[PDB]
């Protein structure tokens, strides 16, 4: 399995092209490597640091995660990995579930313009995954540390397969030949900033847009919740609380968050 090299993210470019003036991005760093962009930001938080609008990107990550929960093994520059701090305390606590939803929407937005022709099943899997042709293209990890939330984005641009990562998919696989990570990071952050603003405003557009690109709605899934608990039903729609309206044989189950696995 040969593989290596790849272009490096230019921090100086992303900085002066994304930080300050009008943008809601206060600060940006690129590191060669870390365990979890989320964990580190979660830590600046706990150290006193205002991480509102602070962006942190890793070239490589041993195990994407943080406060609670481990991770897995990946490969260097095979993907875009970044975290952003978001002040959430001014928004109704019942609405925080939408953040991870917005983030996944923002990723898909950043990427779609790259594909010449829409592939098979490619959209959003409630509540944390961006899929393309039924593979995991991107993962979204939302974590809370009042008055903050950290949004982690792991996006498979190059590849870095295939055990984490057990059925994911990289842009290359969707026929994008020479994806520029910098251009992508820049768009993704622009999409993110926008979606966040919407979320803060309780824009109804945010939910319609989500439902519009939802692969989960209309189909039949298994929702893996904490432990060996699993629910199988048909997703009808989501509520204003970013929760899944799940139709289990005629009876509705409203699961807040958790893993899903499209069956139908």
Residue numbers in the entry: 3 to 266
Lines from the paper:
Acetyl Coenzyme A Carboxylase (ACC), an important enzyme that catalyzes the first reaction of fatty acid biosynthesis, is biotinylated by biotin acetyl-CoA carboxylase ligase (BirA). The Mtb-BirA molecule is composed of two domains; N-terminal domain 1 comprises of 7 β-strands (β1: 29–32, β2: 55–59, β3: 82–88, β4: 124–126, β5: 131–133, β6: 137–147 and β7: 150–158) and 6 α-helices (α1: 13–20, α2: 39–48, α3: 95–114, α4: 173–176, α5: 183–203, α6: 206–215), while C-terminal domain 2 is a SH3 domain with 5 strands forming an antiparallel β-sheet (β8: 220–227, β9: 231–240, β10: 246–250, β11: 253–257 and β12: 261–264). The two domains are linked together with loop L10 (216–219) that connects helix α6 of domain 1 and β8 strand of domain 2. All the apo BirA crystal structures have revealed the presence of disordered flexible loops, which undergo a conformational transition upon biotin and biotinyl-5′-AMP binding.
Structures of dehydrated (dhMtb-BirA) and hydrated (hMtb-BirA) Mtb-BirA, were determined at 2.69 Å and 2.8 Å, respectively, using crystals grown under similar conditions. The transfer of Mtb-BirA crystals to paraffin and paratone-N oil (cryoprotectants) and subsequent flash freezing resulted in the dehydration of the crystals and significantly reduced their solvent content. The asymmetric unit of dehydrated crystal form containing two molecules is more compact and densely packed with a low solvent content of 28% compared to the hydrated crystal forms. Additionally, the most interesting feature is the appearance of two missing loop regions L4 and L8 and 5 N-terminal residues in subunit A of the dhMtb-BirA. The electron density for loop L8 leaves little doubt as to the position of the atoms and though electron density for loop L4 is not complete, apex of this loop constituting residues R69 and H70 has a well-defined density. The two subunits of dhMtb-BirA have structural differences in their loops and defy the expected two fold symmetry resulting in an asymmetric dimer where, subunit A can be considered a representation of the active ligand bound conformation of BirA and subunit B is more an icon of apo BirA with disordered loops. Large shift of ∼3.5 Å in the flexible loop L6 as well as in the β8-L11-β9 region is an apparent consequence of crystal dehydration. The ordered loops L4 and L8 in the structure of dehydrated apo BirA form an open, large and spacious biotin-binding pocket.
